[model samples]
Target: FTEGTDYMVLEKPIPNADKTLIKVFSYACPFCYKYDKAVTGPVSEKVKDIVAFTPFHLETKGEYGKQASEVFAVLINKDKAAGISLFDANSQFKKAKFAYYAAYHDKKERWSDGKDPAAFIKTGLDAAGMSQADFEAALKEPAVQETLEKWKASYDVAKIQGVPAYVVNGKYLIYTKSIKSIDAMADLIRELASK
Candidate 1:
């Protein structure tokens, strides 16, 4: 509830989602992978009614950053179009996110480099039940492109300096050090969204 303590005001803020909770994460960030396994789902569920829960993949922070974002953006758009919550146990976004996380962190696979990301993208495409052709097609979709740009831009918009960050209503970013519990996280998000 206090600035510089629990949260901080963003300088630029997300231009989209007037009243929403945004989770900024990375595929290569180990802590982000951990939160996806624990905090993100529950915290998002708690505040879903009050504010839209959107996950912004940090495009500049990980291995195969843009490519990973593209794959996730595609699956997220897939979920959004199908009325599936990204937090759902079976959501394609979650499936691909976990698949790549395991491949990158657990097994230490690099998929070559971001320059040639085909190998990196395969795990995501495989888990999402999408072929390279479908992946190529979806990457050109307007929604998927916008999602990637928004995610790529939101890092500085929210003044985000770290991974797995929680930003509420675009303007308020919750401090990781101050989060006490899931209920408290939800409470702070609700409080900030009201502002």
Candidate 2:
């Protein structure tokens, strides 16, 4: 597949070690929810040792999205505070994301419906064996907010149209439509990472 036709190549690629896969996504996004189960799960398992995978929560402009972003930031911060590797943090991040999505989409609970975001957050934190108070403190950290904003800015630069978008080494943008299946997507990722 050709760049610009099948996929996009950034003029100024984001700096990273070679063979990094950045998944730009949002918890509120249903497609992203599907991508987690169908794409990320299989792809990560297949390329675990060879390629680095980074899951980026795409920040949106809304109260709901804000709360979700904060929750996600907390998870990332919690992992760092506990001296865990990003690789380990990956599982915790997915747990938080899935829990949040289930509360909103599956359980039909809305933040605007007087439901406490912290309560939903507690479910994820508890599942990860993390402290709820620590999550709250993580939300207040300047670094957490900075990381969220940085990814939001990158979303804008990437002209990301939807969730579950894949950027290979921040250089090649994978067109999900071009890939026929999750296994095929994994193949493409491995091929790109090798280059």
Candidate 3:
């Protein structure tokens, strides 16, 4: 473990026994936001109980990676009910290009700008229906702290070299964006589910 973090590459122990787990590795990616708008709800609704949906936020690899994980972990630990709604807020903030994309593609802003962070964070927490006090409290909670630590460790152990990487059922680690079409994703999920 680096920096007091316990790291390990976690494999989905899906026992080839009819249970299906779908891991969606999302970053605060603008492309991911576009995909979320076009698919997350409908796809999720269609596969709710049929398959397990795991949205893993990538971390510390870059702008999209670091902020997304922190925001996601913070919200998840806050109030799950509201946290889910805030997903859109967090996603939108990241997708804005001002935060994530701007870090590398454009030099208009710096990572330590300080202003950009809290605003997006506030947006997500606000959408989660939490007052500033409540949001602040949530961050201080043990569960939230632990969750953040765990994910950071996971990112290290997973050797997550980049963002938007997908690992399906421990059988394959999808690193590229080959699964582009809706039909293709659906088909792949269905195929993986059957295993």
Tens digits of lDDT, candidate 2, 76-141:
766666665444545566567778777666887665543566665665676656687777777788
Evaluated at residue 16, the lDDT of candidate 2 is 51
Return the candidate ranking by TM-score, descending.
1, 2, 3
Q: Residue-wise lDDT of candidate 3 within 45-83, one digit each (tens)?
A: 455556644455656554445555666666554435444
Candidate 3 global TM-score:
0.59
Candidate 3 Cα misplacement greater than 4 A, ranges: 1-28, 63-67, 77-116, 153-161
TM-score of each: 0.93, 0.78, 0.59
After superposing candidate 2 on the true structure, give the runs of residues whose Cα lies further than 4 Å from its correct spot.
80-90, 113-129, 140-146
How much lDDT does each candidate structure score? Answer: 0.83, 0.68, 0.48
Count the clashes in each prediction.
Answer: 0, 0, 0
The total of clashing pairs for model 2 equals 0
